[model samples]
Target chain A: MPLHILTHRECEVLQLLTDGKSNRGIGETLFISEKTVKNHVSSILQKMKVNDRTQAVVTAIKHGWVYIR
Target chain B: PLHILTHRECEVLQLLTDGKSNRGIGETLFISEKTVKNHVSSILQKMKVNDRTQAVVTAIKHGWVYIR
Candidate 1:
C-alpha cells in the first residue's frame, strides 16, 4: 500500500509549494504560524521520502496528486 | 519561441517530467538505454538547460508539455 497519503493541509501546502511559496509565505497565506508550516513540510518530506521540496513536488506531479496548472 | 525539439525528443521530455529514469524511459519507449541517454542529452541541449529538473522547469514555464 502507498505510505504517503497526504493530509488535506499537506496537500494544500504542497500545492503552494508547487507554486513556489516559501515557508514564510505559505504560513502567511494559510494563517498558520511559520513553525506549523515547517512541521507540515517536514511531514510531507518524510511521507514522500524526498530530499527537498522540489523533489516532493516532482513526485506529487508524477503521481497525479497535484497538477502543474 | 518554443524550443526546437524532435517529436521523439518531446516524448522523452514528457517522460522526464514524469520523473522516469533513463532506463525506465527506454523500457517504456522500447528504446535502448543508450538511446534514452542520447535523448536526455538532446533534451538538455535543446532546452538550454543543464539537468532534467531545469528541463522540466522550462517545459512547465512555456507550457510545452501537458502532464496527464
Candidate 2:
C-alpha cells in the first residue's frame, strides 16, 4: 500500500501528534482550529495508511518522519 | 537549560539553515510572510540573539537546529 505521502502541513501536524499533543493543544499551538486539527489527524491516518493514532506514530518514528529527541 | 524551539521556530530555522528567505519559508509552510517574520523574531528572542545569523549559529552549536 502507498504510505508516507503526507503534505508538508500533514507532516508538521503528525510531528506534533507524535510529541503527544492533543487535538486542541495542536490547534492552539499551530494556530488552527480544533476541527482543522481533527481533519489533519484524519488525513494523517489516511496518508500513512494506518488505522489508529498509535500506529501512525509508530510508523512515523520508524520511517524517520519524526525526530523523537 | 537550553530553550526549546517552538515547532514553527524550528521549521524556520531549518529553512534558514538551508539558505531560504522568509518568503521561501512562508511558501514552504503555507503561512504568510508576516508569520514567517514573527517566527524568526521568536527564534531569535528564544535563542537570546538579535539576528538570524547569530540565532542560527547558536542553535547549530548547541544541537538545537540541524539540516539535511
C-alpha TM-scores of all predictions: 0.56, 0.47
Distance from true position, residue A61, model 2, in Å? Answer: 0.2
Clashing pairs in 1: none
Error of 2 at B59 (Å): 28
TM-score of chain A of each: 0.85, 0.87
Candidate 1 per-residue C-alpha lDDT over A1-69 given as tens digits, one digit per residue, 9 for 90 to 100: 223477889999887766656788889999999999989989988888775565677777767676656
TM-score of chain A of 1: 0.85
Worst 10 residues of 1 chain A by lDDT: A1-10
True contacts kept of each: 0.11, 0.00
What is the per-residue lDDT of model 1 for residues B1-68, given as tens digits with 9 covering 90 to 100?
46489889988888876667778789999999999999989887876766666576567767786555
- Candidate 2, residues A37-63, lDDT tens digits: the string is 889889887876766565565566555
Q: Listing every candidate in turn, what is its Cα RMSD in Å to the true structure after a full C-alpha superposition?
A: 6.3, 15.4
In CAPRI terms, model 2 is classed as: incorrect
For each candidate, give the interface RMSD after superposing the true interface residues on Cα. 3.8, 13.5
